[PDB]
Amino acid sequence: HHEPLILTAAITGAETTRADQPNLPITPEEQAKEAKACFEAGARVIHLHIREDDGRPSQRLDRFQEAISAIREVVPEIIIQISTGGAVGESFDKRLAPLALKPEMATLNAGTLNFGDDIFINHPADIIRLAEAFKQYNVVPEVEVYESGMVDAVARLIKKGIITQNPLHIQFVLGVPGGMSGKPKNLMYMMEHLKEEIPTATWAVAGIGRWHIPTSLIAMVTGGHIRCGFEDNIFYHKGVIAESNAQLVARLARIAKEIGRPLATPEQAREILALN
Amino acid sequence: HHEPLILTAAITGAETTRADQPNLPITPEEQAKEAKACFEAGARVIHLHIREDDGRPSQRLDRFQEAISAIREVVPEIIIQISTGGAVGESFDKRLAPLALKPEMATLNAGTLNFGDDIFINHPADIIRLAEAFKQYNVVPEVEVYESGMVDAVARLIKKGIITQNPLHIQFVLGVPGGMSGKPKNLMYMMEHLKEEIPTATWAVAGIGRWHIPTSLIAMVTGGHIRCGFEDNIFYHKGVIAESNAQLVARLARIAKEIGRPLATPEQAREILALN
């Protein structure tokens, strides 16, 4: 718990509505304002989904460029990580295309799983073509794993030379209905499983909904990094809607200050994530 | 390791070929002969997939009835458990239909996962309609779980009253490329996770390929039950093709005898699995 802590803010996502979370940033300007407040509260990475002005999820490259430019202009030092997951059911071609904008980092979903009432599909041949696109556009991946078997699947892609990023950054996404939950036994199992299978990988955790607090506090004291935000959780407390993404980031920064864990500077975040 | 041991023989499966495993039983008569040898070697359950005479996987109800009748006639006491998984890619309607034959037991796959180069699809709405069909035809399920999150998903179906079977029998299917592996850390994690989430559930393990021996020896001494067979593993030793499914069953029976774990009688197997 003395190693620097990287906080990611997943500020928008594909499914959160403005009716449930009135402070949900939808436009590039709203997303830039939120990103500045999150950076000042301690966030070093923004996990970015884009929306049309009507709130529907978007995959348009011009809209992604608009949001990336707006965020970059308010906080040049923040790391802008784009989502290649998008909205469940979106075509894989549309999910892959924004890598052509050459972001510093982007997500790489490592498997298929039932996801609420639907299926989040990542066909093995599509995972390989996405992994190949990361190499061609020189984008560093954040590999998203929702279950134990996805760690093994990623290890096999490393062994075959399909994923060559080293060190590799994994994010455990815990709490999806259909995926592994965020209970402490599970996060401890996952970090130890990852250490066995991909020994040099670094990791972060996203705890959906009620799992935000248990995943965050374990990650605090096990060297992991943490994601928070409206994409994953709109509540500050049970039954109490959050005021902003920055409010969620600031609580994690306050707990890190209480326990003496320093927040990573932008330079340290880029060094840990091998973005230089 | 003093509790009775139930051995399941998965004798055929959907993908194993006769060229790789010349002793693969394909016809109902061949499957009955294998089932008798497996029963005499210690198996109390047969996990049944059917094939056409040309070796292609089948879902025909008349072919399922032919195989069930042939096995029943050689060993009336064996438990015949039919597969509702079938061949990856088969239509869900064809996978569900054989429950109408009212077998004593059948498999119920609890989630979707990448499975080798393809996806084994179990849409959440199809899992619910299959669970409903088990109730209507008074069939006891064996719930197949390939990942941690599938245990939580099954617990939510129990909470909603969609799965009412109690005690419920779970089988951990470990070693699929895309699913959780069969390493000892994983089987220990899964039995403890299941005890937390579905405390009265019983369990078995199927260790695909190289995971057959590690899963079997852990299950031996943790009270679990074991599945073996050509569907999951065609080798008796690394690089040494097995002579029969009964050879694989007999090794497990010999190890159980060495350590003093009794094999379940047919009556004990039916009592543990709540088939009476």
Next chain:
Amino acid sequence: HHEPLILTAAITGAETTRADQPNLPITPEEQAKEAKACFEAGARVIHLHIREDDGRPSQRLDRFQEAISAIREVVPEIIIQISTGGAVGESFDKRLAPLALKPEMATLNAGTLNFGDDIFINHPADIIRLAEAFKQYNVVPEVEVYESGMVDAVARLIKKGIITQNPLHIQFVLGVPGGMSGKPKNLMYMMEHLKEEIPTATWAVAGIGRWHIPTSLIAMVTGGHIRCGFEDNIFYHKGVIAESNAQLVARLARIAKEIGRPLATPEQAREILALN
């Protein structure tokens, strides 16, 4: 994590020196002042060792009565838990005798271990006669466990009817040089091992030195209770001396408030610990 949190303050101990920790309470008056400040900061239990005015550890019943009375006079709501461990090397007769003062609670050390440069001795026959004295004097024990095997040893005393207290309160004491450390894998293992062996037991954790923060944050989100204080840790941060025991308690209360875990009232602490 809405379950009430009981904070224990171990304010003095037997070995801490005022040379290392200038604000260590030594006398009954100093201990009463600290106990009131700890109670106001959120502590519901004081774990009490006594000292002579010169700072030497004491086992005298008149001195224990002086300290108990001084604390009760200024903060009657707090639970005063006396130590039967005392200073390593103390005679077992002197360690047992203060149970005759009929405190609400007292510690019951469940095994022997190397403890720094010495041995903390708890002979099996002495553990049994101490367990019998808890029954004789109607005192509730807090059972101190430093290793996995002490949980099994306590389970055997329960089976034999030597310990009949139900529910039983266990405290994991982690970080002793010679005992189990406070790394997160260990505290997760211990709570799970205790759930298997003594399913109805409640638990707390004391994290010695550098293990204070990792044990506290894991206990926060797993339903455990927490001990802090100069007996276990004199530092607020690595290389930063704590200002008082109440400063350590207040940090835990602030983290609990951040995450929405309520602090137990005195009535709830007595109900959970079965002190009524």
Next chain:
Amino acid sequence: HHEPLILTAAITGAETTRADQPNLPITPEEQAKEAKACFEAGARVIHLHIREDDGRPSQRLDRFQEAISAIREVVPEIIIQISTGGAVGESFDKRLAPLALKPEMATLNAGTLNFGDDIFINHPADIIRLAEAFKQYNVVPEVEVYESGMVDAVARLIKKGIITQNPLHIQFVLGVPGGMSGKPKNLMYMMEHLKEEIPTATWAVAGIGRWHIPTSLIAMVTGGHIRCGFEDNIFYHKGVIAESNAQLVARLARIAKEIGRPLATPEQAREILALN
């Protein structure tokens, strides 16, 4: 699980009686006969305690030399590992002295624990002087661990350069009343904890009494080595006395042959244990 398996036979011990186990070897001639039968059954190490002709435990160097010479004369290939634990209650000077006989290997008990009705004492200063005697006499240690905290204590002696043996061989001694039990969760925890704290250490497990089978089957498939014998367990099955130590060794050799795990040759056992 193709890694060679080293079997140790702990043939006599200090406490086993011929009244409970009529075929217990007591004299040097009896111990030599048993050692040859154990070697032929697959054992590569003899863990040696000596007795007087009346069955009383001994620490005499002339009696140790008699037993070592008798075993070497009939089976020179076996590794003779002497006990420095001896009978609980024995003086530390008498326990250390036989290292002057310059055996190939000897045990090094890494902590104190309650042991049945007594205490097995290993004062921290005595552990250090024993570690120094291993260097003085050029003997390789087998470090005996009964609890998690003993692994940390050994790691601290390595850090201080008190133990310089590399690779270090640890034996987990599980099932002592007072020590960690041999349940599968515990052996999995211990091998993983040892991998975190002493990454290059090799390990074996001794499962006392009823824990012999669960520890052996887990070690079989996790790369560990196994100890068996009358010192730890006199029963072949629950309520079935073992016929000899070689009968216990032969069962482990049969299970290893069933699963395809080779037994170490004497040369491989000396290479793995760094005895050349």
